[PDB]
Amino acid sequence: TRPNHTIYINNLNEKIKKDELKKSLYAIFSQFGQILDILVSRSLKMRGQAFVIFKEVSSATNALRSMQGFPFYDKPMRIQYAKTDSDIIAKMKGTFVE
RNA sequence: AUACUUACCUGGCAGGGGAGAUACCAUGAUCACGAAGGUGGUUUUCCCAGGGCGAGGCUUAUCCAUUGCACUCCGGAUGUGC
Incomplete structure (x- = not known):
């Protein structure tokens, strides 16, 4: 709940493949600032979620405000900060510590 | 039903993966101890010559469950072609 360089997005359509989902998320989410990476997995725990790593927390914070609920493959997007x-x-x- | 002699009617010969290495077996080699080699084995590397085991791995749908906070790939099963 406390701002972070990274935002966490869940409730994504699970049918979209990793490379497809990374591509369209970069396209969709680049509008708010420079993105260093989008990490997606389709595992049981990790399917349906993506991490967008922004250079600035302010882009993350602004991205959170705007995309909360955004229609994505027939589903409103849920966004949080990374813990x-x-x-x-x-x-x-x-x-960083291991 | 068996063997013997004759006439008539039918029909193509050689064979069983191949090339190297075998110290050991067989051939117990016709000259005062002996062969080598070869042939027929057993052992041993390959062009892999075809098969059997399908573990592992690759492509895509169906079914089930998950709202999951990761940064060392990876939820479970059936089907299609490898």
Whole structure:
């Protein structure tokens, strides 16, 4: 609930393949700022979710405000901040610990 | 029903993966101990020559469950072609 470099998105349509989903998320989510990476998995735990890593928390915060509920494959998007910094975020800060 | 002699009617010969290495078996080699080799085995590397085991892996739908906070690929089963 506390702002983060990374936003967490869930309630995504599970039929879309990883490369398809990464592509359209980059397209959809680039409108708000420079994106370093979009990580998707289709595993049981990780299917239906994506992490968009922004350079600035403010793009993440603004992205959260705008896309909350956004229609995506017949489903409103749910967005949160990542609970923890992403390794590429944490190494840039030098906060990273295994 | 069996064997013997004759006439008539039918019909193509050689064979059983192949090339190397075998110290060991067989051939118990016709000259005062002996062969080599070869032939027929057993052992041993390959052009893989066809098969049997389908573990593992690749492509895509059906069914079931998941609202999941990851950054070392990977939820379970059936079907199509490898």
